Amino acid sequence: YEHVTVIPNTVGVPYKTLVNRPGYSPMVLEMELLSVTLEPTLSLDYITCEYKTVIPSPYVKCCGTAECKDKSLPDYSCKVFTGVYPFMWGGAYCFCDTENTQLSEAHVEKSESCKTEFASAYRAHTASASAKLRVLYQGNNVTVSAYANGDHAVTVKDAKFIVGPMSSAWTPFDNKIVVYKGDVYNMDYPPFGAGRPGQFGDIQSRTPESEDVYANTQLVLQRPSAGTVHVPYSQAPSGFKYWLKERGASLQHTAPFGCQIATNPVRAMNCAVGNMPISIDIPDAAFTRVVDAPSLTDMSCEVPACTHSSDFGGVAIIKYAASKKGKCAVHSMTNAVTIREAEIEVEGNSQLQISFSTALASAEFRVQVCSTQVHCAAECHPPKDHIVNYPASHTTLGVQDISVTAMSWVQKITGGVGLVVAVAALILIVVLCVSFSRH
Amino acid sequence: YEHVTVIPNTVGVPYKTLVNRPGYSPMVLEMELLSVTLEPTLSLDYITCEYKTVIPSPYVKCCGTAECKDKSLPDYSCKVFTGVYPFMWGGAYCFCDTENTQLSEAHVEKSESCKTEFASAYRAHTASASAKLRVLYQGNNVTVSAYANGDHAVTVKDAKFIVGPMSSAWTPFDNKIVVYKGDVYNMDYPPFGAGRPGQFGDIQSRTPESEDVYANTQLVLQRPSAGTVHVPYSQAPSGFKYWLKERGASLQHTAPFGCQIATNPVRAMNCAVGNMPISIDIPDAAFTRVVDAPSLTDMSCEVPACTHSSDFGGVAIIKYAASKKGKCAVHSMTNAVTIREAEIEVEGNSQLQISFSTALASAEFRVQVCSTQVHCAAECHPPKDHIVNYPASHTTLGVQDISVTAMSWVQKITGGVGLVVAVAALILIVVLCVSFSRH
Ligand SMILES: *[C@@H]1O[C@H](CO[C@@H]2O[C@@H](C)[C@@H](O)[C@@H](O)[C@@H]2O)[C@@H](O[C@@H]2O[C@H](CO)[C@@H](O[C@@H]3O[C@H](CO)[C@@H](O)[C@H](O)[C@@H]3O)[C@H](O)[C@H]2NC(C)=O)[C@H](O)[C@H]1NC(C)=O
Ligand SMILES: *[C@@H]1O[C@H](CO[C@@H]2O[C@@H](C)[C@@H](O)[C@@H](O)[C@@H]2O)[C@@H](O[C@@H]2O[C@H](CO)[C@@H](O[C@@H]3O[C@H](CO)[C@@H](O)[C@H](O)[C@@H]3O)[C@H](O)[C@H]2NC(C)=O)[C@H](O)[C@H]1NC(C)=O
DSSP, rough: OEEEEEEEEEETTEEEEOOOTTTTTEEEEEEEEEEEEEEEEEEEEEEOOOOEEEEEOOEEESOOOOOOOOOTTOOOOOEESSSSOOOTTTTTTSSSSOOOOOOOEEEEOGGGGGGEEEEEEEEEEEEEEEEOOOOEEEEEEEEEEEEEESSSSEEETTTTEEEEOSSSSOOOOOOOEETTTTTEEEOOOOOTTTTOOTTSEEESSSSOOOOOEEEEEOOOOOOOOTOOOOEEEEOOOOOOHHHHSOOOOOOHHOOGGGGGETTTEEEEEEEOOOOEEEEEEOOOGGGGGGGOOOOEEEEEEEEEEBBBOOSOEEEEEEEESSSEEEEEOOESSTTTTSSSSSSSESEEEEEEEEEEEOOOOOOOOESSSSSEEEEEBBOOBOSSSSSOOSSSOOOOTTTOOOOOOHHHHHHHHHHHHHHHHHHHHHHHHHHHHHHHHHO | EEEEEEEEEEEOOEEEEOOOOOOOOOOEEEEEEEEEEEEEEEEEEEEEOOEEEOOOOEEEEESSOOOOOOOOOOEEEEEEESSSSOOEETSSSSSSSSOEEEEEEEEEEEOOGGGGGGGGEEEEEEEEEEEEEEEEEEEEEEEEESSSSSSEEEEEEEEEEEEEOSSSSOOOOEEEEESSSSOEEEEOOOOOOOTTTTSTTTTEEEETOOSSSEEEOOOOEEOOOOOOOOOOOOOOOOOOHHHHHHHHOOOOHHSSSEEEEEETTTTTOOOSSSSOOOOOOOOGGGGOBBTSOEHHHEEEEEEEOBBOOOOOOOEEEEEESSSSHHHHHHHHEEEEEESOOSSEEEEEEEEEEEEEEOOSSSEEEEEEEEEEEEEEEOBBBBOOOOOSSOOOOOOOOTOOOHHHHHHHHHHHHHHHHHHHHHHHHHHHHHHHHHHHOOO
C-alpha cells in the first residue's frame, strides 16, 4: 500500500500521518527529520593566497651601464639606477665613483604557505538534497538515509521510502562563493586573470599546485638609498591578508532559515524552508485486519488539564470498553491538536492517558483511538514562561480558532445587530409593499 | 582602449570588427571561433551493467528435510524441493528414494565486466562554457583559449580578452543523461533502488566498485528435472544488454544546431546557438597614428565580376593615390557585403584588389581604406551551383535589399499610382472647396 504525505522541512519536529487502508486497522507513522543537507555542486575557479615578492641580489657594474631583460614571470619589473655608489662594511664596493650602475629586478610568486593557507573561489550551480529521516514503524525506530531529490528509494524492513523532491529550491549559497577552512562566504570574487592590487584575488592560480600564476600587485622598484645596496619597492599589500581581517561574518552566522554551514564538502544543513513530500510503500504483512483488532466502544474523553505551552502540556484521559486485549493507533482529527503517542495498548474497561499540544484557547478536538472516535473539550491556560529553547510541536491557528467563550460573545453581538437589521428590513419591506398597494 | 563587439556563435566563420580610436588609424580585427565547448557539470547517480546470477552447488539431503535462512544478498531466493531422486554418472546420489530434499538458492551480483562495460546515469545541471578563438591581431594569428562565461581574462601580446557570457543558456543535454562510452543519451533513467526487471536499471550501484547493489530480476527458482542435479530458474534477461541493442541514436547524431557530442569529459561542441560577446583591451602600442599612416585620395572603385555565391565571389578593384608607403585596414561600411582581406599594402598611385561576398543582387557598398571611403557598385550574377559543403561567408538578405533595376520598377509603379491618387484627391478637394463656396 502506497501512502503519500507531506511534512514541513523543519528538523527535529515529529509529524504523524494516518495510514487508512480499508479492511485494515488504521496505522499511524511518526516521522521526524534528523538532518536535511543541501550540497551544492561546485566548480573551482581559482585559488587566492598570500604572495611572495622575490628580489634576487642586485647586480652592480662598477663602470658601465647594466641592461634590462624582459621575463615572463607573473609580475616582473626591472630597472637600472645610474649614479649609485654603494658601501659595504669594509668600504666602497666599487673602484669607480660615478659610472657605477645598479640593476634591480623583482617578481611575484605564490607563497609556500599557499599549500595550506588559501581561499578557494567556487561557482555553485544546483544543490543535491539529502535527508535522514526517523520513522516509527511497527512500533520500532528505523532510520532512513536517502537523497531527497525524489529519485532515491530506500527499503527498510520491507517498507520503501521515497523522499522529495523539495518544495523549495532555495539555497543559502550564491552563485559565487569563497571557502576558507570551514568559513564559506557569498561574494562576487573578481574574474580570473583580472584581479586588482590590495583586493581579494590579487594573486591567482587555478589550482594550489599550478605554476600558472596571475599577479597584479603593481610592484614598482625604487631607487636605493645613497651608499646602500638594498632594493626598495612599492607594492600593494596582499589582498588575501586584508581579506582575512575584513572577512566579516560567515554564512553559518548570516544565513536565513537557521541554516548550518559546513565544509569538506560544502553543505547547508537543516534549513527550515519549504515542505518535503514522503511516499511510503507499506507491505501487507505490516497491517492488522480490522476484525483482528480491538473494538473500542462506550468511549468518553475527560481533560483534567490543558496549557498551550508548546511542549505537550495538555493531558486527556479517555475511558473505553475494549472488546479484547491488543494495540490501537491514536490519531488527532484536527491539525490544531497534536498527540504525542502514536499507539496505545487497550484491555477491558479502562482508561488511557494521552499528552497533547495545542495553540488553542479552547481544545475542542476529536481523537481516533482505534477504529472509533471520541470528542474532547477543555479550557486551556497560557504558559508562564515567555521563552523556550525548542520549537512548538503544535501548528499555528487561524482566525476561526478563537475560544468558545469568545465565539459565544461574537455570536450574541453579531446576532444582536443582525436582528436589528432584519427587523428594520422587514419593516421597510412591509411599508414598501403597502406603498405599492396604494398605486 | 576597450573595444566591445559581438560575434555570432558560429564555428569556422571569420568576422570583422572595426576598432575606431580617434587620433589613430582604424584597425580591423578578424575573429574566428575555432571551438566552442559547453561542459555540463555532472553528478553521478548510479552505474548499470550486466548482472551475474550466482548459483552455489545445490545442497541435497537424503533421508531428511533441508531448510534455509533468508540472506541480505541483493536478490536472494531460496526454495526446498521435496521428492527429489537425482542421479550422477555412476548411479543415484542418495540411498533413500522419496525422503530426499534439495535446497536451491541463488542471488544476483555485479559481473566482473562491470568495471569495464557499464553505463553511467548522470545528473546534468549547468554548463561551463569555454571557447578557442583565433584573432588576427597586429597582422599575426593569435590563439586565445578562455572560458566563455564573462570570466577568465586572457592576455596575449599584452591584449586582454574577455569572452562571453553566452547569449543563450541552451544546452543539448537534459537534466538526466546516460553515458555508455563515447555516446551520451537523454534518458529519463529510473530512480535508484527502484529499477524494473528486463529494463535499464534492473541492476544498480552507486559506483563501479561499490558493494551496494540493487537488483530486481524476478529471479524465481524452479523445481529441478527429475533425476537431474541442477537449479533451473526464471529470470528477466539483463536490461543492460537489452538497452545496448535498443539504444537508438545518441545525442551526437540527434542533437540540434549541429552540436558535436563527446565524452570523458562530457562535452557539447560547436553548437550554433545565439552569440558570444567579446571585449578586447588593446594597448596603445598596437595603434598607428593617423599622421604616420598612409593617406589615400583620388579613390575610385570598379568590379570586373560579381557572383552572389556563398563563397568569396566578386572582386573589387580600387584605384588610389597614397601619400606614403605603408599598410592600412580595409572595412566594409555595410553588413550586406563582407570583405575577405583585413589589411592591405599601399604605395604611390596604384590599385588594390580585394575579394568580397554578398547576398545582394545589386552590390552597392562603401569601402573604408586608410580612413578614406570609396563607393563601389556592381551587378551580381547568381551562382550556377545549387549546393556547397561550406557555410556562407556573407550575411542574410534584408527585405530592403532589392536590385537597382527592380527598385526602379517599384518606384515607377508606386509613383504612377500615387500620382493618380494625388490628382484624384486634388480634384475632389477643389470640388468640395467649391461646394463650401455655395451659400
Ligand atoms: C523512538 O525514538 C523517539 C525519539 O528518540 C530520539 O530518536 C531515537 C531514534 C534515538 O536516537 C534517541 O536517542 C533520540 O532521543 C523516542 O522518544 C524519546 O524517548 C526518550 C527516552 O528514551 C525521551 O527522553 C526522556 O523523556 C522524558 C519524558 O517524560 C523526559 O522527562 C526526559 O527528560 C527525557 O527527555 C524523549 O523525550 C522521547 N522523545 C519524544 C519526542 O517523545 C521513542 O521512545 C523511541 N521509540 C522506540 C520504540 O524506540
Ligand atoms: C591567419 O590564419 C588564417 C586562417 O588560417 C587558419 O588558421 C590558422 C591559424 C592556421 O591554423 C591555418 O592552418 C588555418 O587554415 C590564414 O588564412 C588562410 O590561409 C590559407 C593559406 O595559408 C588559405 O588556404 C588556401 O586557400 C586557397 C583558397 O583559394 C586554396 O586554393 C589553397 O589551396 C589553400 O587551401 C585559407 O583559405 C585562408 N583562410 C581564409 C579564411 O582566408 C591567414 O593567412 C593567416 N595569416 C597569418 C599572418 O598567418
